[PDB]
Amino acid sequence: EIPIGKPQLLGGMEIAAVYLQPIEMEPEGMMRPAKDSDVHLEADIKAAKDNTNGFAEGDWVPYLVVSYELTHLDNGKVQKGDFMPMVANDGPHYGDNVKLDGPGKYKLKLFVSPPSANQHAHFGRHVDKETGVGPWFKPVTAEYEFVYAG
Amino acid sequence: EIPIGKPQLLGGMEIAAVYLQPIEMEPEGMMRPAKDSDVHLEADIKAAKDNTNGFAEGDWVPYLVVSYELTHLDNGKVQKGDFMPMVANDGPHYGDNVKLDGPGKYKLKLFVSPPSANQHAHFGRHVDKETGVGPWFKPVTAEYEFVYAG
Ligand SMILES: [Cu+2]
Ligand SMILES: [Cu+2]
């Protein structure tokens, strides 16, 4: 794995980015095939100390809505995608197999939003006095930059 | 909180059940309202030692499909539903607000399926040699008998 940029403290969480070789995933048809990709991009999102959404320090934060924008700074080529939650041998991540635009410098923007809290919600929030937690974090954007060699 | 039955090691996880006061949740409408309920049933599902699906011992296992049948053994009345994932000040869990059927003996049967069965929120599994994990556990069931005071 090659770390990207620096881990950033945002929304009560530590948000880091990494990339490695393209991976293979079940269900297969829900990610770009490894054969057609250059890297697997991963967002590492863990709860920071004193998290106000019920998570202890170091916990993976599940059910987030995570997207990305990748720019080849050399020529300005922009590409956008979504991350999918998935589990690997080192635990759960948000990831996507990505085809890049050759070597050069890249800017990575991560759009991290909280779980849906309307009629489409997957993930709930206790709000009683004894066991309730604070409101979902406001959506954040984390910026990175790296040089791709391969 | 009142523990019910006994914790059970199944599918590489430890599955325990409690109930407590009906809890108020946001969004409003993703679960039976608290004042229309008698208890909040909760499944406590954590990875066991040497989990084969990539989760470290003691971690919460997210994106599971947890459904239930709750029988009032005293008269055979059955009620059914799904547990939904949610977070409280002591972490995430699966649960449901339920209206009971008076005092007496109850049997809660949990049906637990892996995240590959999750319609609501897709969740992937690495399957390459380098970063992959073993196949998802086959669906398990677990029962918890308890006496409700009323
Ligand atoms: Cu991944
Ligand atoms: Cu709960």
UniProtKB/Swiss-Prot annotation, chains A, B:
Keywords: Signal. The keyword Signal applies. Coiled coil: none annotated. Belongs to the UPF0423 family. This is UPF0423 protein BRA0381/BS1330_II0378. It comes from Brucella suis biovar 1 (strain 1330). The chain holds residues 26 to 175 of 182 of the full protein.
